[PDB]
Design a protein around this ligand. Structure first.
Ligand SMILES: CO[C@H]1C[C@H](O[C@H]2[C@H](C)[C@@H](O[C@@H]3O[C@H](C)C[C@H](N(C)C)[C@H]3OC(C)=O)[C@@H](C)C[C@@]3(CO3)C(=O)[C@H](C)[C@@H](OC(C)=O)[C@@H](C)[C@@H](C)OC(=O)[C@@H]2C)O[C@@H](C)[C@@H]1OC(C)=O
Ligand SMILES: [Cl-]
Ligand SMILES: [Cl-]
Ligand SMILES: [K+]
Ligand SMILES: [Mg+2]
Ligand SMILES: [Mg+2]
Ligand SMILES: [Mg+2]
Ligand SMILES: [Mg+2]
Ligand SMILES: [Mg+2]
Ligand SMILES: [Mg+2]
Ligand SMILES: [Mg+2]
Ligand SMILES: [Mg+2]
Ligand SMILES: [Mg+2]
Ligand SMILES: [Mg+2]
Ligand SMILES: [Mg+2]
Ligand SMILES: [Mg+2]
Ligand SMILES: [Mg+2]
Ligand SMILES: [Mg+2]
Ligand SMILES: [Mg+2]
Ligand SMILES: [Mg+2]
Ligand SMILES: [Mg+2]
Ligand SMILES: [Mg+2]
Ligand SMILES: [Mg+2]
Ligand SMILES: [Mg+2]
Ligand SMILES: [Mg+2]
Ligand SMILES: [Mg+2]
Ligand code: NA
Ligand code: NA
Ligand code: NA
Ligand code: NA
Ligand code: NA
Ligand code: NA
Ligand code: NA
Ligand code: NA
Ligand code: NA
Ligand code: NA
Ligand code: NA
Ligand code: NA
Ligand code: NA
Ligand code: NA
Ligand code: NA
Ligand code: NA
Ligand SMILES: [Sr+2]
Ligand SMILES: [Sr+2]
Ligand SMILES: [Sr+2]
Ligand SMILES: [Sr+2]
Ligand SMILES: [Sr+2]
Ligand SMILES: [Sr+2]
Ligand SMILES: [Sr+2]
Ligand SMILES: [Sr+2]
Ligand SMILES: [Sr+2]
Ligand SMILES: [Sr+2]
Ligand SMILES: [Sr+2]
Ligand SMILES: [Sr+2]
Ligand SMILES: [Sr+2]
Ligand SMILES: [Sr+2]
Ligand SMILES: [Sr+2]
Ligand SMILES: [Sr+2]
Ligand SMILES: [Sr+2]
Ligand SMILES: [Sr+2]
Ligand SMILES: [Sr+2]
Ligand SMILES: [Sr+2]
Ligand SMILES: [Sr+2]
Ligand SMILES: [Sr+2]
Ligand SMILES: [Sr+2]
Ligand SMILES: [Sr+2]
Ligand SMILES: [Sr+2]
Ligand SMILES: [Sr+2]
Ligand SMILES: [Sr+2]
Ligand SMILES: [Sr+2]
Ligand SMILES: [Sr+2]
Ligand SMILES: [Sr+2]
Ligand SMILES: [Sr+2]
Ligand SMILES: [Sr+2]
Ligand SMILES: [Sr+2]
Ligand SMILES: [Sr+2]
Lengths: 337, 53, 132
RNA sequence: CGUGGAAGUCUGUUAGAGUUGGUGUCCUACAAUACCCUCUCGUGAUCUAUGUGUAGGGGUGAAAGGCCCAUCGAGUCCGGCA
RNA sequence: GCGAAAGCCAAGGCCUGUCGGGAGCAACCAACGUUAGGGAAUUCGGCAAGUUAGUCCCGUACCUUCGGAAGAAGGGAUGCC
RNA sequence: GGUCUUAAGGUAGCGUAGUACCUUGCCGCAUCAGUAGCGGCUUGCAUGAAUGGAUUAACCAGAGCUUCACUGUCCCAACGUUGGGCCCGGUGAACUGUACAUUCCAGUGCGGAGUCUGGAGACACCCAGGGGGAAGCAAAGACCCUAUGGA
RNA sequence: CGAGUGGCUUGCUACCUCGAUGUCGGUUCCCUCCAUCCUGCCCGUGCAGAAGCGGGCAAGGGUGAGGUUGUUCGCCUAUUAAAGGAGGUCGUGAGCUGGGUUUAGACCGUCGUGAGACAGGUCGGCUGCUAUCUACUGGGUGUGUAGGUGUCUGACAAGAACGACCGUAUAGUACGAGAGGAACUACGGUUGGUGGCCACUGGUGUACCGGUUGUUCGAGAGAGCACGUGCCGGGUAGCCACGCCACACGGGGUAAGAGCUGAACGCAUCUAAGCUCGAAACCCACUUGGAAAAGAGACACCGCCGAGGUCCCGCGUACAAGACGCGGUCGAUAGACUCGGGGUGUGCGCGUCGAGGUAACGAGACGUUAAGCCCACGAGCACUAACAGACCAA
């Protein structure tokens, strides 16, 4: 009677086209709870190595025992929050109001931006406060870039600019916190936002695989048995029925695979540190050597080596944070062998 | 741990452990060793092995 | 069931000829089904270490032959991943016949057993010679 | 036990003959019957060149209505014929 | 080497089974190699593929028109110096 | 039934058959499970003696089934090799074409519409793809009926 | 007995096509219906419990593997939460398959004088086409919005991004004479689906290294051929799955339903006004897309004689063309060299030994030698090549 079966692949990550920005853009942000802070950071993917841990989970029968955990190394040097953008609540959603910039700029920010020479940080700040008085101020976000120059293995010096949200206390107190970071030089580290043991959401633009067929793109079957030798190997049975006299967008077809934005949920930060403790012998294959500010994220992270990945505190965590896990051993053994 | 074939130190979180018919246990550091063992070769006879040198 | 404390890559399928690691009189067992399993279209139902399977006796004593009994997969050739990351593989694929109450039908268990089987089926463990 | 070396005998891509499956390749072809692998026969009722005989309601046919110049349950050409 | 067999090479012939250049050269297709664990669950059907293999020694069932079955099956051996 | 039609009235055998409608007949073998296969039974819709019956060693690119061995046939797909495919120079056809044509969901209509009616959607052009639709292309249906047709 | 709904079966009719709308079954891939098999929330019970039986709302998700048969259907097995049914030209042959029906060959049975027949059986018996239009999947080029760079907004669009099960504590407890035997909640894991990633395991790896057969280059050394690696052994990077990571809760409004207050109708009444609850379903949440949203958007800064861009050069985190991304001496972008990190497994030569042999000769063994050969990765390193320079632009 023709057995049932779920459709090949998900319709939720559509359309399967190339990403507009190689730098990921978050569409969701955490809720306003504790003390005001920047809701995210960023780094550059380095590679994978394993780490030995002590089981933190109270409900695990293995609590306190030795456990091997796969970890991805991401180089996370300090970022610079160059501006404070303000949004206003309009009958057409949220719209940007004004921006508060600075004087101190990183030597090579001009490779991406048309750096401000003449700006009024006071009149901008005034417009935001007069809007808060009116009860029209939406949320508070900071324009932020990365220092790829600080990362020797990444070829680019051209900074990856992206906006991040500041949430926390009252809208008045987080306006102050936001302006306070900017007015200095905008310098902040991963220690300022995250603590080892917390669950984070890692966004990334996947490994580009060009144009691929249905078997790889949608995971459909290959032609089986006698059908496999007839001249059709990796092509689906049909493009749809007689009626409707058209091909639906839901039928698995060929095209672009990879280079898509993916936001991978609930990623545990195993350790945040500095130096050469996680580097592999002979250097990370197709990347380089790690010596500086890093982050060890549990499991996989979207994208290849050298790519920019974004961080955010989990908007929907499953477990309660079990802070600063004990690290018994980090492997430095060559990835060649 | 040490490899029950070549004698080098098995990097923690790596390797395979083969269980024999009688119950005997043999830890291996890599597939290279496993395959050399399956060929009936004894670690003493191969020069690259830590047992030999 | 209770957590095995290891990740198993199923090495057996429906119709697989495996060994009977006991003194029941049954020599070769044939997998028919797996307890609490429900696959997907075209996929052959898979069985592995720690699974309670349903079996038919292919070889053995005239009395034990042709019988449809339940069993537990003790050993398997395809590697299983323990918490410390180490893989463990066996010489053969083996099972021990079990009754309704998850107790072994025979008295003596031939060959080694995995420590993971001990957590799920206790009276099979307390009947085992070697536990690896 | 040896000798002998019979056979519409056996194995065999020897030469040569044949054409089972792939229902592969091709299917505006390389080709109006092709290509590749697989397969059968291979001292005999064997295969083959050349010459020669049988002609259309007639031949030829170990018989399939097979074949008789890409033409066959009655060849082809022209005529009867507008 | 059993060989008018394979494979390799002479003599002799040829680069005219007659359009070329570029992309680590994607999807897809044609021929094809290797795939862990399982082992025909595939399918109308093991279709396709694979297995086996040469030589010598041992050994060989039912049945039989006594010719045959039969290389039955199964076991062992195999290089170089 | 314990002869009658029309001469005789199925003997040896074989039998659910390449012949058995009922039918997947019943029993058994075999498998977890066997409309299959084999053995037995067998009243045979509608077996049977040169319209040759039964049987059979050897032979078979003949039809069906079982086992060992084998394996990407399958679970379930991966990577690779060679020629294409894609881009460039040169060469250079054909199929097909009433017209218009960016469609889609409904409806209507000779009852199976890109073109009618209502709505919806729709900026143009170009590259690659696998073929959903044009009741796609290809051949005055080889089925069926009809012709005071043919062989 | 009576009234109907559907359009899956069959039958009828003969409206459509005979200058052809390819068959049945299967397969593959997509959407749907509800008359619901499972899962959620309910009501009744001949509801103690447990296991059921019947009914309501409900189409989110699921509904699987196999033995005979061409079968659909159906029979049978073991698993399962359950292994529901139906529509899409009895969905799907310019996708596959070709086992059955239904050509030409042949046999059997029956019928027939016979040719030959059969809504009887049986063996064999072919699968065409270079896509013009349209449709969708992905990729570009222009135009509109009316100079640029960077960051956003969110009209709308897509999602199942998650479904389900087993076990433990609750508990041998509630309930029950006993046998038997729950739940709320909290946890652990499995399965199916989904997205991604390669540290680990596994595969490939006609890169590479070794062994070795035949033959050829006189031997040696070192090589070629054996189908695109002769075969065998090992295998880096990358790509992969058989490997690994991740994939809530909760709100809001409802259905069936349980209720509150409450009148018509002094009472009663969940309903008529009003209100409190309440489904795996809906909406939000979350993920993806999305300035061509014609109301054609917002902010900041740079620039209108110069901001920025294109071509150019060195290259890939990108790639079928096109596109995208980075670097360009104020430089580590690529190559050479040297390290490091890796693959293989101990080089040629020489010395000793070597069963033997008068000697010649001698397979092979040990040493020299973690040797020799090799690397799709990293580092150091401006040595070499990123030069010269052209164009557009308010
Ligand atoms: C249905 O079986 C087909 C199989 C094959 O189909 C044809 C070819 C397809 C046939 O087309 C199909 O013919 C059927 C009789 C009717 C069918 N229609 C109902 C649709 C028609 O189309 C189909 C079946 O798709 C064939 C007739 C086409 C055509 C132009 O007439 C023709 O004759 C050409 C010279 C073809 O040569 C031959 C001998 O057919 C060639 C083009 C070759 C290369 O293509 C083919 O051979 C294909 C294999 O041959 C037909 C004669 C058979 O028809 C029947 C009833 O059995
Ligand atoms: Cl298929
Ligand atoms: Cl099963
Ligand atoms: K017709
Ligand atoms: Mg590696
Ligand atoms: Mg390793
Ligand atoms: Mg199937
Ligand atoms: Mg002649
Ligand atoms: Mg005839
Ligand atoms: Mg395999
Ligand atoms: Mg075959
Ligand atoms: Mg019978
Ligand atoms: Mg007679
Ligand atoms: Mg058609
Ligand atoms: Mg006609
Ligand atoms: Mg006819
Ligand atoms: Mg006539
Ligand atoms: Mg209903
Ligand atoms: Mg639905
Ligand atoms: Mg089947
Ligand atoms: Mg149909
Ligand atoms: Mg079609
Ligand atoms: Mg075609
Ligand atoms: Mg048939
Ligand atoms: Mg037939
Ligand atoms: Mg066809
Ligand atoms: Na084809
Ligand atoms: Na069709
Ligand atoms: Na042939
Ligand atoms: Na004539
Ligand atoms: Na013959
Ligand atoms: Na293959
Ligand atoms: Na089409
Ligand atoms: Na009706
Ligand atoms: Na009808
Ligand atoms: Na069909
Ligand atoms: Na449903
Ligand atoms: Na069936
Ligand atoms: Na049709
Ligand atoms: Na076809
Ligand atoms: Na069909
Ligand atoms: Na609710
Ligand atoms: Sr159907
Ligand atoms: Sr953003
Ligand atoms: Sr959004
Ligand atoms: Sr075909
Ligand atoms: Sr239509
Ligand atoms: Sr002969
Ligand atoms: Sr055929
Ligand atoms: Sr042809
Ligand atoms: Sr072939
Ligand atoms: Sr022969
Ligand atoms: Sr004439
Ligand atoms: Sr020559
Ligand atoms: Sr020429
Ligand atoms: Sr190999
Ligand atoms: Sr079979
Ligand atoms: Sr032998
Ligand atoms: Sr009789
Ligand atoms: Sr006879
Ligand atoms: Sr095409
Ligand atoms: Sr005709
Ligand atoms: Sr229910
Ligand atoms: Sr079968
Ligand atoms: Sr039917
Ligand atoms: Sr039936
Ligand atoms: Sr057929
Ligand atoms: Sr018939
Ligand atoms: Sr029939
Ligand atoms: Sr215009
Ligand atoms: Sr319980
Ligand atoms: Sr009890
Ligand atoms: Sr009690
Ligand atoms: Sr070669
Ligand atoms: Sr109500
Ligand atoms: Sr615009």
């Amino acid at each position: 009677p023709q057995p049932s079966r779920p459709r090949k692949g998900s319709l939720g990550f559509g359309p399967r086209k190339r990403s507009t920005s190689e730098t990921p853009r978050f569409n969701s942000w955490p809720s306003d709870d504790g003390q005001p802070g920047v809701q995210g950071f960023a780094g550059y993917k380095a590679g994978m190595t394993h780490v030995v841990l002590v089981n933190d989970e109270p409900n695990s029968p293995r609590e306190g025992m030795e456990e091997t955990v796969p970890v991805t190394v991401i180089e996370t040097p300090p970022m610079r929050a160059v501006a404070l953008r303000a949004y206003e609540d309009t009958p057409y959603g949220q719209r940007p109001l004004t921006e508060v910039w600075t004087d101190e700029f990183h030597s090579e920010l001009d490779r991406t931006l048309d750096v401000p020479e003449d700006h009024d940080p006071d009149a901008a700040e005034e417009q935001i406060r007069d809007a808060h008085e009116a009860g029209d101020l939406g949320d508070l976000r900071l324009i932020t870039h990365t220092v790829p120059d600080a990362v020797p293995s990444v070829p680019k010096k051209k900074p990856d600019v992206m906006e991040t949200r500041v949430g926390g206390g009252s809208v008045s107190d987080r306006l102050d916190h936001a302006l306070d970071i900017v007015e200095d030089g905008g310098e902040h580290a991963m220690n300022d936002i995250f603590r080892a043991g917390e669950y984070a959401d890692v966004a990334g633009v996947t490994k580009g695989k060009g144009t691929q067929g249905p078997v790889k793109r949608w995971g459909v079957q290959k032609r089986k048995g006698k059908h496999a030798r007839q001249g059709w190997r990796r092509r689906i049975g049909n493009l749809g029925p007689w009626n409707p006299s058209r091909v639906r967008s839901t039928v698995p077809q060929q095209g672009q695979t990879g280079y898509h934005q993916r936001t991978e949920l609930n990623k545990r930060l195993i350790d945040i540190g500095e130096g050469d403790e996680p580097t592999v012998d002979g250097g990370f294959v197709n990347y380089g050597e790690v010596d500086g500010p890093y982050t060890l994220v549990k499991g996989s992270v979207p994208g290849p080596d050298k790519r920019l990945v974004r961080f955010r505190p989990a908007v929907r965590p499953n477990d309660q944070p079990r802070l600063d896990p004990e690290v018994r051993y980090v492997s430095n053994e060559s990835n060649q062998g | 741990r040490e490899c029950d074939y070549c004698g080098t130190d098995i990097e923690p979180g790596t390797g395979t452990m083969f269980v024999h018919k009688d119950g005997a246990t043999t830890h291996f550091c890599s597939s290279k060793c496993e395959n050399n063992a399956d060929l009936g070769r004894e670690a003493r006879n191969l020069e690259w092995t830590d047992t030999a040198r | 069931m209770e957590a095995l404390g290891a990740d198993v890559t199923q090495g057996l399928e429906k119709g697989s000829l495996i060994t009977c690691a006991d003194n029941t009189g049954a020599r070769e067992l044939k997998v028919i089904s797996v307890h609490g399993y429900s696959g997907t279209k075209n996929r052959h139902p898979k069985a592995g270490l720690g699974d309670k399977i349903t079996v038919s006796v292919t070889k053995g004593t005239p009395e034990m032959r042709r019988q449809v009994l339940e069993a537990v997969v003790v050993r398997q050739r395809k590697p299983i991943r323990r918490p410390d990351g180490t893989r463990v593989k066996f010489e053969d694929n083996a099972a021990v016949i079990v009754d309704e109450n998850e107790d072994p039908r025979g008295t003596e268990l031939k060959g080694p057993i995995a420590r993971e089987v001990a957590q799920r089926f206790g009276s099979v463990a307390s009947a085992a010679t070697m536990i690896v």
